[PDB]
Amino acid sequence: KDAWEIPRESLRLEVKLGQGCFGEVWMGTWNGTTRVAIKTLKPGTMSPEAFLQEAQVLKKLRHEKLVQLYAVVSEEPIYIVMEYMSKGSLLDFLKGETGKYLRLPQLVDMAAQIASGMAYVERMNYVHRDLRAANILVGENLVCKVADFGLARLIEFPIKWTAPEAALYGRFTIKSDVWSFGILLTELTTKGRVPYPGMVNREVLDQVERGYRMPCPPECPESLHDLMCQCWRKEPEERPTFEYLQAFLEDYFTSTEPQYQPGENL
Numbered sequence: 483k484d485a486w487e488i489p490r491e492s493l494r495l496e497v498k499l500g501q502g503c504f505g506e507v508w509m510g511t512w513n514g515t516t517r518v519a520i521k522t523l524k525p526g527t528m529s530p531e532a533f534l535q536e537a538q539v540l541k542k543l544r545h546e547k548l549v550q551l552y553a554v555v556s557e558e559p560i561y562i563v564m565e566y567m568s569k570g571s572l573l574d575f576l577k578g579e580t581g582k583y584l585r586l587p588q589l590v591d592m593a594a595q596i597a598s599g600m601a602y603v604e605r606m607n608y609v610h611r612d613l614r615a616a617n618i619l620v621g622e623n624l625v626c627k628v629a630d631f632g633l634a635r636l637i638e639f640p641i642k643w644t645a646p647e648a649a650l651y652g653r654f655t656i657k658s659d660v661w662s663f664g665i666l667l668t669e670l671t672t673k674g675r676v677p678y679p680g681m682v683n684r685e686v687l688d689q690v691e692r693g694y695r696m697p698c699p700p701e702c703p704e705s706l707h708d709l710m711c712q713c714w715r716k717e718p719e720e721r722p723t724f725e726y727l728q729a730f731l732e733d734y735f736t737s738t739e740p741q742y743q744p745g746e747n748l
């Protein structure tokens with residue numbers, strides 16, 4: 483046991499937020515004062531330090547644009563205790579009521595924050611393995627954080643967000659996260675629309691290997707789709723860094739699209 487462990491008696495499992503093939507997610511209260519969120523094991527569901535190795539990644543990672551670990555439980559019943567994100571998933575946020583008021587400036591800045599989280603990941607020498615809008619939590623003031631490193635690792639599988647070399651040959655790198663970041667960029671600019679519309683997994687895998695790439699989403703600037711294309715380069719090592727992507731997006735509206743005017747959607 484380590485210093486990340488707490489008494490479970492500390493924990494008010496209150497409202498329910500979701501389920502899965504893993505367990506649940508709950509709003510709750512920690513030591514009576516603190517709002518938290520808990521990813522649960524409903525008793526047996528799966529392996530101990532499989533559920534509890536997303537902790538071992540999340541313990542050593544610690545950035546403002548990453549969802550924060552608060553504590554863990556193995557005094558079974560079992561829990562992963564984390565920082566509570568008020569507006570839920572970026573996917574739900576984009577599809578929901580506020581989604582449609584979202585404009586490029588907002589969307590680019592969300593992209594930015596995420597780039598920022600991932601750039602930290604990048605210099606910590608970790609890989610996320612599952613980057614996509616569904617694993618981005620939104621809080622107040624349009625804040626976005628990376629969450630659910632649930633497969634993550636030191637650099638020692640829903641394929642539409644997955645880089646070819648990673649889906650096919652299991653080559654997961656920060657460079658394959660980048661690939662996913664570019665796909666994540668199509669989600670933001672379409673307001674949550676599933677990538678590769680009308681295509682099934684195997685068809686996506688076959689067309690992407692022949693070099694098919696998603697075209698510029700409607701009302702999305704060419705400069706922003708260029709960036710997605712860079713993120714989707716065949717050779718992993720030619721994809722840009724999260725550091726370049728972070729700085730590119732923060733500076734976007736001055737350095738890159740300094741003449742942008744809003745349309746009916748973006």
Ligand SMILES: COc1cc(Nc2c(C#N)cnc3cc(OCCCN4CCN(C)CC4)c(OC)cc23)c(Cl)cc1Cl
Nearest residue numbers: 499500519520521549562564565566567568569570629630
């Ligand atoms: C702890 O373990 C993990 C937990 C999570 N999941 C969450 C964490 C975290 N972290 C924090 N806070 C969350 C808040 C949620 O909903 C709150 C508000 C929802 N509404 C949207 C619609 N409007 C109009 C009302 C508000 C939520 O919904 C499912 C999931 C959350 C992930 Cl993604 C990964 C890991 Cl590893």
